[PDB]
Amino acid sequence: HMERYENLFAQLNDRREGAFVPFVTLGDPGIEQSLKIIDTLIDAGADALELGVPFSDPLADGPTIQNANLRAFAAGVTPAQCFEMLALIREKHPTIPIGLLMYANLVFNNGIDAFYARCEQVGVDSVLVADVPVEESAPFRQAALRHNIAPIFICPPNADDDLLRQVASYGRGYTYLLSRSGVTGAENRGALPLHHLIEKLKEYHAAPALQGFGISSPEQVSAAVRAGAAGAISGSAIVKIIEKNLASPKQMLAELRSFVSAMKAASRA
């Protein structure tokens, strides 16, 4: 059991820093271009990664990520190829925490327990299953704990107390704090004084809280840390830069670098 999340947060704490975590779809817009997009993200200052595996029916994603899956699907990407990518990424960056954004069927397809064994074999640190709520999570988190994978659980803005004590006790690595309602998109931002949620998450000894959904400006990364969160996740913002610069591979990485440099800078003491 590596402790890549536990350590990153300890280090960031001693530097009174916040975490910035970009999301991308694996193989968007192609395996090789995706591999060097992730390399540009880590180099530009990303503290951790959340990576999506293309799925045919992403019922939790808005249009931006929906396009990313189809771009990836037009390239021949498979769950098998994605695991070869995850292995290469770990071989290049030993310390960065890598989390998977998964849809349930890809995990359940040929055995929940075999999917989490593969993640451990390739160096994946955490797995969030978008369509498995806490009430249905038992076989997933049990399989994840048996393979030293942290199960990530979404804490929505409408959460009551029983949920928060469940999320605090079942989850490891980090807690996904939803900014708003609905699905994925940089379009809709709009936090809901998460302050109190973050306090009882801390009161219930939950894993550090990362806020996600709608985070597209460095002022949001700053505000989130000040609210009590340990950092921010931003997905569609990254994916939109890729989508905009498809015919310009060298300028795509250039703006990708300048965006991560901005959000990461918004996170430090």
Binding site: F55, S56, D57, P58, L59, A60, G62, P63, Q66, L70, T78, P79, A80, A104, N105, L106, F108, N109, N110, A130, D131, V132, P133, V134, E135, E136, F153, I154, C155, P156, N158, A159, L163, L178, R180, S181, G182, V183, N188
Partner: protein, 394 residues
């Protein structure tokens, strides 16, 4: 925790994002409450009788069974307002929405039949209705789309994914996740996340209850078997429900065979698929070896769901109900046969159920058997499709 069991054996569950769980737990409490409320039942019963046309007929088919020992009755859900059984449960679901204070209605549709029933229910009960439909379905169901729009509904084409029914199902749950505080998602079949399989069953169970009463009256006995086609399972579990504890009664569900099970181009996940997790439930599915959900195929646009209701998968596993398939050609022939000999134009969907009943009759013509077929819809929507088929040959 829930008030009701979300599982039929290993099948079912509530596999939705965490944000949608309060919406589901709210829907379940409204349902359990409305089921104990006599003034809810009175209102429901009244819309079914005086607006929808219940009870529907149970028609005997002397002509089609001549020369054999089979007696065939048709449950005439084709005579229901809207032309299909879909109307039964949208009236109950729309009353559930108002009971929760909801103002808007979200719906998914493939053949357009559920979209039309959702629209008519919304027009009647003063609800603003928006309907999602794959862009490939919209182009192919311009009649039903126009009907939906005539009835005040917003038809939103979905270009995501493969632009068919499973993609409209995705867009409705996406919509619902942000709008659930004002809107109700009116799922169109006995599938999806709990409490929908339970709710859709209980709102379609008058089909079987009426059939039991009407057959005890006309024949003095229970049927040997009731036969229904299975897209998502709405009309089939509606017929099965009141008979599940009458263990002497056979329960036969017919999945679309497409061009043939051997050809891979079918829509029979219950018997020829693999259990997966999608649309908020654990159920058999049409999927790649990778776990990507693919499409069904059928000549019948209404049997295009890529999965099946979990209670059907459960009833299959304990051996209580049996599930067969019927190819496109078999359905077209049953379609032709009911037109010429009983003067009823069935839906291509229900033609699958009838085609299996004709097979039970024809393969063993001396078998004494009392059969009931659920005629889930009328076939006026399919005469164009049937025309182009037999124009391409003779």
């Amino acid at each position: 925790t829930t008030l009701l069991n979300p599982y039929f054996g290993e099948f079912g569950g509530m596999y939705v994002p965490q944000i949608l769980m309060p919406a589901l737990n709210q829907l379940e409490e409204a349902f359990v409450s409305a089921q104990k409320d006599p003034e809810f039942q009175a209102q429901f019963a009244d819309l079914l009788k005086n607006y929808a046309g219940r009870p529907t007929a149970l028609t005997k088919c002397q002509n089609i069974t001549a020369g054999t020992r089979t007696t065939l009755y048709l449950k005439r859900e084709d005579l229901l307002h809207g032309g299909a059984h879909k109307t039964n449960q949208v009236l109950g679901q729309a009353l559930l929405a108002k009971r929760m204070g909801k103002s808007e209605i979200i719906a998914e549709t493939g053949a357009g039949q559920h979209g039309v029933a959702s629209a008519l229910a919304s027009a009647l009960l003063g609800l603003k209705c928006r309907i999602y439909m794959g862009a490939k379905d919209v182009e192919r169901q311009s009649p039903n789309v126009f009907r939906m729009r005539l009835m005040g509904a917003e038809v939103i084409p979905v270009h995501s994914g493969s632009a068919t029914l499973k993609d409209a199902c995705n867009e409705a749950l996406r919509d619902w996740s942000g709008s659930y505080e004002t809107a109700h998602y009116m799922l169109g079949t006995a599938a999806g996340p709990h409490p929908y399989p339970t709710i859709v069953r209980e709102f379609q169970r008058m089909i079987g209850e009426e059939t039991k009463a009407q057959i005890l009256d006309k024949e003095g006995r229970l049927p040997d078997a009731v036969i229904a086609c299975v897209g998502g399972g709405s009309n089939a579990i509606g017929m099965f429900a009141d008979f599940i504890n009458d263990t002497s009664v056979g329960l036969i569900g017919v999945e679309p065979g497409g061009h043939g099970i051997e050809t891979g181009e079918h829509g029979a996940p219950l018997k020829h698929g693999r259990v997966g997790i999608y649309f908020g439930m654990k159920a058999p599915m049409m999927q790649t070896a990778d776990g990507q959900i693919e499409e069904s195929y059928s000549i019948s646009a209404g049997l295009d769901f890529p999965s099946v209701g979990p209670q059907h998968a459960y009833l299959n596993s304990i051996g209580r109900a049996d599930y067969v398939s019927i190819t496109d050609d078999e359905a077209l022939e049953a379609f032709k046969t009911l037109c010429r000999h009983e003067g009823i134009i069935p839906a291509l969907e229900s033609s699958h159920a009838l085609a299996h009943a004709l097979k039970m009759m024809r393969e063993q013509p001396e078998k004494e058997q009392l059969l009931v077929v659920n005629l889930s819809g009328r076939g006026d929507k399919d005469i164009f499709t049937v025309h182009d088929i037999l124009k391409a040959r003779g």
